[PDB]
Design a binder for this molecule. Structure first.
Ligand SMILES: CC[C@@H](C(=O)N1CCCC[C@H]1C(=O)O[C@H](CCc1ccc(OC)c(OC)c1)c1cccc(OCC(=O)O)c1)c1ccc(Cl)s1
Length: 123
């Protein structure tokens, strides 16, 4: 399935190259620009543990990139995305909720999978 495909063919986009955040591009986006730190980003997404599933396609999910507003894997991964791109991210716990988790929904040491569509980003 999609998480296995990410494992096998996904690019390690971590600085440390510890396979903490693996990405595959599922739909190529437009042009070359990708967001900078501070940019306001607009996405649609859904995600799941590697059993819990959550989906945000009415209002976009909005955040400012690279400011610690989301889990580290998203500050890393969304930064790499072009407008219009859909990507899969497989995420080890160090780049998500770690040992504390986020109970009850997210257990300790959870791996997370997300499908993310970057709709737009603005300065
Ligand atoms: C419902 C939780 C969601 C989830 O894990 N996220 C939601 C979508 C973005 C990725 C990730 C997330 O960062 O959750 C964060 C959770 C809180 C959090 C923020 C920063 C963090 O580190 C810097 C952090 O680390 C533990 C946790 C979140 C959730 C809702 C909104 C939000 O920012 C916008 C705002 O506050 O209005 C951010 C998942 C969906 C399916 C999963 Cl399995 S986990």
């Amino acid at each position: 399935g999609a998480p296995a495909t990410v494992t096998e063919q996904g690019e390690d986009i971590t600085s440390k190259k510890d396979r903490g955040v693996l990405k595959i591009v599922k739909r190529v986006g437009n042009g070359e620009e990708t967001p900078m730190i501070g940019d306001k980003v607009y996405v649609h997404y859904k995600g799941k543990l590697s059993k819990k599933f959550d989906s945000s396609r009415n209002e976009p999910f909005v955040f400012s990139l690279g400011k610690g507003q989301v889990i580290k894997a998203w500050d890393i991964g969304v930064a790499t995305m072009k407008k219009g791109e859909i990507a899969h991210l497989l995420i080890k716990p160090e780049y998500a909720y770690g040992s504390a988790g986020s109970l009850p929904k997210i257990p300790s040491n959870a791996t997370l999978f997300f499908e993310i569509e970057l709709l737009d980003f603005k300065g």
